[PDB]
């Protein structure tokens, strides 16, 4: 039991590390689109394609 | 007297080998129990793994 649980403990520990590594790379690589779709709703709320 | 002494050692070895019977049944049951419980052990280990 303790072998298993310690394994999963540090498993999710440096898993968590990889979680953050993915996270803040995506946190920036998801900004180039702040334009595109904002445009969409900006017209979808206004009723003219602009 | 001859009757009693022959009956004595007759019952003696009856007892001895029947005791071997019960205790060997016991050791087979012991290996059985160790088997089943360690199976339970690591099938719980993998439960905590997932």
From TrEMBL, chain A:
Subcellular location: Cell membrane
Keyword Kinase: no
Keywords: ATP synthesis, Cell membrane, CF(0), Coiled coil, Hydrogen ion transport, Hydrolase, Ion transport, Membrane, Transmembrane, Transmembrane helix, Transport
GO CC terms: plasma membrane; proton-transporting ATP synthase complex
Coiled coil regions in record: 2-29
GO function term, MF aspect, one: proton-transporting ATP synthase activity, rotational mechanism
Major localization listed first in the record, in broad terms: membrane
Function, in words: F(1)F(0) ATP synthase produces ATP from ADP in the presence of a proton or sodium gradient. F-type ATPases consist of two structural domains, F(1) containing the extramembraneous catalytic core and F(0) containing the membrane proton channel, linked together by a central stalk and a peripheral stalk. During catalysis, ATP synthesis in the catalytic domain of F(1) is coupled via a rotary mechanism of the central stalk subunits to proton translocation. Component of the F(0) channel, it forms part of the peripheral stalk, linking F(1) to F(0).
Family: Belongs to the ATPase B chain family.
Subunit-level organization: F-type ATPases have 2 components, F(1) - the catalytic core - and F(0) - the membrane proton channel. F(1) has five subunits: alpha(3), beta(3), gamma(1), delta(1), epsilon(1). F(0) has three main subunits: a(1), b(2) and c(10-14). The alpha and beta chains form an alternating ring which encloses part of the gamma chain. F(1) is attached to F(0) by a central stalk formed by the gamma and epsilon chains, while a peripheral stalk is formed by the delta and b chains.
Listed name of the protein: ATP synthase subunit b
Species this chain originates from: Mycobacterium tuberculosis
Residues of the full protein shown: 115 to 164 of 171
Automatic annotation (TrEMBL), chain B:
Coiled-coil parts of chain: 1-47
Subcellular location, record wording: Cell membrane
Assembly: F-type ATPases have 2 components, F(1) - the catalytic core - and F(0) - the membrane proton channel. F(1) has five subunits: alpha(3), beta(3), gamma(1), delta(1), epsilon(1). F(0) has three main subunits: a(1), b(2) and c(10-14). The alpha and beta chains form an alternating ring which encloses part of the gamma chain. F(1) is attached to F(0) by a central stalk formed by the gamma and epsilon chains, while a peripheral stalk is formed by the delta and b chains.
Function field: This protein is part of the stalk that links CF(0) to CF(1). It either transmits conformational changes from CF(0) to CF(1) or is implicated in proton conduction. F(1)F(0) ATP synthase produces ATP from ADP in the presence of a proton or sodium gradient. F-type ATPases consist of two structural domains, F(1) containing the extramembraneous catalytic core and F(0) containing the membrane proton channel, linked together by a central stalk and a peripheral stalk. During catalysis, ATP synthesis in the catalytic domain of F(1) is coupled via a rotary mechanism of the central stalk subunits to proton translocation.
Entry's family note: In the N-terminal section; belongs to the ATPase B chain family.
Protein name, per record: Multifunctional fusion protein
Organism encoding this protein: Mycobacterium tuberculosis
Full-protein interval shown: 51 to 100 of 446
């Amino acid at each position: 039991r303790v072998r298993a649980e310690q394994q999963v403990a540090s498993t999710l520990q440096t898993a968590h590390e990889q979680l953050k590594r993915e996270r803040d790379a995506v946190e920036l690589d998801l900004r180039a689109h702040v334009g595109t779709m904002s445009a969409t709703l900006a017209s979808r709320i206004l009723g003219v394609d602009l | 007297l001859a009757e009693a002494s022959q009956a004595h050692t007759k019952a003696l070895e009856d007892a001895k080998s029947e005791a071997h019977r019960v205790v060997e049944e016991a050791r087979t049951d012991a290996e059985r129990i160790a088997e089943q419980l360690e199976a339970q052990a690591d099938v719980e280990a993998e439960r905590i793994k997932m």
